[PDB]
Amino acid sequence: GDCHKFLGWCRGEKDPCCEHLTCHVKHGWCVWDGTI
Numbered sequence: 001g002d003c004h005k006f007l008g009w010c011r012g013e014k015d016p017c018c019e020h021l022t023c024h025v026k027h028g029w030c031v032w033d034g035t036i
Contacts, residue, residue, distance in 0.1 A: 004030050 017030035
């Protein structure tokens with residue numbers, strides 16, 4: 001189950017992202033999270 005690439009496309013889809021990422025509904029692309 002490959003993970004969506006960074007700054008990909010989340011809008012319309014409801015699937016998980018790569019490590020340290022979260023499907024952004026508003027923006028519409030996986031963004032960094034947890035690493036700070």
